[PDB]
Each structure stands twice: as C-alpha cells, then as structure tokens.
C-alpha cells in the first residue's frame, strides 16, 4: 500500500540526505547502509521470478562494496586516528575507498551488475535507481576529491566510457541500453572529478534531467523492447517525435543542452594540459551516440509496420499525467545559452 | 611471553581458512563459531570485555542459529565436508600455507554508557533503520 | 603496527577472497560476508581499546548492528531464490 511505499522511498531520500549532511565518516557508512535496506524492497514491487534475482544481484554487489568501504575507513583511522572526512592518510586504504565507491557508481570494470539489474525492474524503479542512487557515492567523492590518486580515477573513468560504449551497440530492449548510457556518462562525471568538482556537479545535473526525460517518456508510452517502441509513432506521434530530441541531447550534438557537460569538461582538463585524454574520451563519446541514433531509427524517423490491434487503442487517451515531465524535457535541451549560470554552483 | 593473544589470532585466521572455503554452509557455521569464540577471547585480552561478550552473545548466539535455519531450507542431499572436494580442500590448504608463511615471517563502561545521553543521534538513526528493516522483511516475504 | 593487527587484516583479506571465489549455492556467500563483518568489527574494537578514545567505544556495537542488519535482510532474498529452485547460484 502507498502509505508504506512512500515511507520507504522517503527513507531512501533520508538515507541519502544523511550522506550529504554528516561530516563524520561513520554516519556516511550508515548513510549508505540505511540506503541499501530501503532500496531493495522497492525493487521487489509487482514481484517477478526475474525481479527476485535482479535484487539478488544488486544487494550482493552493494553489500560487498559497503564492506570494502568500511574496511578502508577503519584502516584510515588506524593510521591517523580521525573520523572527519578530509584527506585520507594511507594510500593502501585510499585506493580501496576509491574501489568501494567505484562499485557504488557502477563504474567499469565493476559495472557488470548495472546493465543486468536494470533489466529486472520496472521503469519506475529503474529510473529511480539510475538517478537517486548516483547521488550519494558522488556526494562523498566530491568531499574526497582532495586526495584521489588521479591515475586510478582516470583509468576507471575512461574504461567506463569504452565499456559504456561497446556494450551499448549490441542491445535491443531499451532498459539495458539506458543502463549502458548511464554507465557511460558516469565515466564523464568521474573523469573530471580530480580536476574540478563543480564541473562534475554540473554534468550530474544534466544527466539526471536527461534520464528523467527518457524514463518519463518510456513510462508515457510503456515501450520496452525496441520493436515495442517502434509502434508508437502512430499512437501519440508527439512523444516519439520527442524521444528523438532527447536522444540527441544524450548524444551531445552541440546546439543541444547535453553538449554543455562535455564542452565544459574539455575545458577544465585542458587547463591541466592532459590534452590527449579528452581527445580519446570525446572520440569515444561518438560511439556512445551511435546507438542513440539507431534507436532513433527504430522509432520516430522511420515507421516500423503497425499491428492492426492498435486501432482501438486510438480511441483512448493516455491518463495519469506526470506533471514534472515537460520541464524535464525542456531543461534538458534548450538550456545551452545558459551555461554561465553554472558558476552559481561555484 | 605467552603470545597467547597472538596465537589466538592465528587460530582465528585458520578459522577463516576453513570458513572462507565453502563446504556446505553448516560447517562454515562451525567456522564462525570457532572464529567467534576466538574473537571474543582476543578482544577480551585487551579488556573490552563487554564487547567481546556482545559478539559472543549477539553474533554467535544469534546469527549462526538463524543460519542453522537456512540450511534447513537449503541443505540438498549429501552436503560436502571439507575433504569432499579437490577445490575445497585445495582451498583450505591454500589458506594454511599462506598464514603459515606469515607465522614464518572501566573506560568501556561509561564509554558505551555515553551512547544514550551523549550520542542521541545514532540512537535515532539505528532505531529508524532497524524498524524499517522489519518493514522490509515484511515487504519481501508477504 | 603490531603483528596481531596484520593478522586480523589478513583474516579480512581471506574473508573477502572467500566471498569472491564464490561457488555453488550462495548461502555460503552470506556466511563469508558475515565473517568479513566480524573481522572488521574486531579490527575496530581493538583500536578503540588501544587509544583510549572513549566515545568510539560506542561505534563497534553500532557497526555491528547495521552490518548484522543487512545480513539479516540477505537471508530473506535467499528465501525467495530458494523458493523457486532449492538454491544454487548456478
């Protein structure tokens, strides 16, 4: 019943807010820990023989991640007797805190759980998993940007983009594709993190807005497998005719908003020299674009054959409108001549 | 001296050698029993007695019992002993050689009493957490 | 750092490698995870006993709680997977 569901989801919100507030480490590990328990059940609504093992995957990886994290905290304490976030004082510990967080974001090569888990749940729980869960671990990485061992960070940051690419060309059903999209953008967030966190948080905001746009659209059409999406051009042409655009904003074609992340990132890293890395990165982001395009071909640009049975469905308007949606489209697209406002994030 | 705390650490580690190898959960439950009592002993040696008895009570007197329930739900005929497979036993030996290579190489009272008066925040989040954990168990099993 | 701590840390490393070698029915993994939990606990408590950093005497037990708590959750999922098969990771 909704009265319990809402308490769970609110305690997830709390279970992340807690990470964003507390300075003491123990309250952060508590933040993730409470977040987990409240995250699993919401994946289990409706409940499927499939969904169950989805949640098994998610829990199993999040649990081992949280374990390594707490271990590395304890080692940090052993070699500096502190609990405040700040710098860590022992590289053998620090790399593990980086690993634990690397699982929590789902960055490659730790990534393999994310495409699978997404498959196992409905687009509601899916969207929430790909947005809200991406806050907390980043919320702590921004706080430990000061001492990060950049080599280790850029390697996962790149490899997340290659794997976020190649594994994206291959799939049909959309949810797995959304998984590889996100797994690819996280490479771009976590890449620039050692150099300048404000660019990260900018990119984060764009990513969340974007994936809200998509998942609200998939909800609006209840499409899933690519073919299932293909029929929608005749029933409610607008929304396919809008998936095209939001997809291009994923692709970062430059007038569109989604270009704003990359094009600030390239700036920042370029101040650092490091000129080669963004070139490889930006080149691969293309590869990321391509399956957004193919998916666009299944949908709006071209009309796959309709099934007959569709006709009766034409009489019936969609209902239960999702208020927040139109703004999530528009912000995730047209906002490009409002980059400078990014400095609001200081 | 006796090095008794240290040799306890050694029995602890082999407790995880036979435990981390994976030969039917029940025997692993034995592994955590042995490692459990060894654990409480080791922490007892520094005199944080209340804690060692927490783990000797709350953990081993709680957990491994409920695992003594999961196996009733899992089991499968002919569970394997440590000796019952080449990879399992191979693993156990694999732990032994390593750890052997390593060998070849009150304040508490008020300290925890402080939890209530002087640390209400943790009490709040633990209360809330355990509560909604019960709720989660509901919303899975139901 | 005194050798004992090194020994417990190593018990952690085994308590992880055991989780990841990961085989057959997964109930073993919930065990190995709990063992991992216990090693972190002990390694914490020895420290708080060491420096008489008294407030932190509260943490290990609190640590224990949530950690045990998630494991308490974990069995439930296993039930469900056990419910349709008679469990195996395979």
């Amino acid at each position: 019943n909704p009265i319990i569901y809402t308490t769970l989801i609110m305690t997830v919100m709390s279970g992340t807010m807690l990470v964003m507030i507390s300075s003491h480490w123990l309250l952060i590990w508590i933040g993730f820990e409470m977040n987990l328990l409240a995250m699993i059940p919401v994946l289990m609504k409706n409940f499927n023989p499939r969904a169950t093992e989805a949640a098994t995957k998610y829990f199993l990886t999040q649990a081992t991640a949280s374990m390594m994290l707490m271990m590395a905290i304890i080692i940090n304490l052993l070699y500096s007797g502190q609990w405040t976030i700040t710098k860590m004082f022992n590289p053998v510990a620090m790399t593990m805190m980086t690993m634990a967080l690397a699982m929590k974001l789902g960055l490659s090569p730790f990534h393999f759980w994310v495409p699978e888990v997404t498959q196992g749940i409905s687009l509601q729980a899916g969207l929430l998993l790909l947005t809200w869960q991406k806050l907390a671990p980043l919320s702590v990485l921004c706080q430990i940007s000061q001492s990060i061992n950049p080599n280790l960070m850029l390697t996962m940051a790149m490899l997340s983009i290659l794997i976020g690419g190649w594994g994206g060309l291959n799939q049909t059903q959309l949810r797995k594709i959304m998984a590889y999209s996100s797994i690819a953008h996280m490479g771009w967030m976590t890449a620039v993190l050692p150099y300048n966190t404000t660019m990260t948080i900018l990119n984060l905001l764009i990513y969340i807005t974007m994936t809200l746009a998509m998942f609200m659209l998939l909800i609006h059409s209840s499409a899933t497998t690519t073919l299932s999406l293909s029929h929608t051009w005749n029933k409610m042409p607008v929304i396919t005719s809008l998936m095209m655009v939001t997809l291009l904003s994923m692709g970062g074609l430059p007038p569109l908003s989604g270009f704003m992340p990359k094009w600030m990132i390239i700036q920042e890293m370029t101040k650092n020299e490091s000129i080669i890395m963004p070139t490889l990165m930006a080149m691969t982001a293309l590869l990321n674009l391509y399956f957004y395009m193919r998916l666009a071909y299944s949908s709006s640009l071209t009309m796959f054959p309709s099934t007959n049975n569709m006709k009766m469905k034409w009489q019936f308007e969609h209902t239960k409108q999702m208020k927040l949606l139109p703004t999530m489209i528009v912000l995730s697209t047209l906002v490009l001549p409002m980059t400078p406002a990014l400095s609001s994030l200081n | 001296t006796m090095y008794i705390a240290f040799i306890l650490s050694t029995i602890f580690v082999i407790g995880f050698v036979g435990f981390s190898s994976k030969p039917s959960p029940i025997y692993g439950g034995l592994g955590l029993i042995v490692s459990g009592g060894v654990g409480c002993g080791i922490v007892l040696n520094f005199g944080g007695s209340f804690l060692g008895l927490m783990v000797f009570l709350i953990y081993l007197g709680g957990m491994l019992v409920v695992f003594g329930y999961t196996t009733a739900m899992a089991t499968e005929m002919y569970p394997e002993v440590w000796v019952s497979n080449k990879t399992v036993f191979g693993a156990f030996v694999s732990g032994l050689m390593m750890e052997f290579c390593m060998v070849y190489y009150s304040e508490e009272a008020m300290g925890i009493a402080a939890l209530y008066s002087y640390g209400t925040w943790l009490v709040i989040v633990t209360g809330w957490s355990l509560l909604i954990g019960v709720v989660v168990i509901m919303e899975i099993t139901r | 750092m005194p050798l004992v701590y090194m020994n417990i840390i190593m018990a952690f490393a085994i308590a992880l490698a055991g989780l990841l070698m990961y085989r057959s029915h997964l109930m073993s993994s919930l065990l190995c995870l709990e063992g991992m939990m216990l090693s972190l606990f002990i390694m914490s408590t020895l420290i708080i006993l060491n420096t008489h950093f008294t407030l932190a005497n509260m943490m290990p037990i609190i640590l224990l709680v949530f950690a045990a708590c998630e494991a308490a959750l974990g069995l439930s999922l296993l039930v469900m997977v056990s419910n349709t098969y008679g469990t195996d990771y395979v």
Partner: peptide, 15 residues
C-alpha cells in the same frame, strides 16, 4: 612485514 604495508613485529604487549 614486507607485504602490503609494514607490520612492526614483536609481542603484542608492547603497545
């Protein structure tokens, strides 16, 4: 100990 990071050795009592 050379592994991972140094283990200072000797008996436990010393600390």
């Amino acid at each position: 100990v050379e592994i991972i990071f140094k283990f200072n050795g000797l008996g436990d009592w010393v600390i």
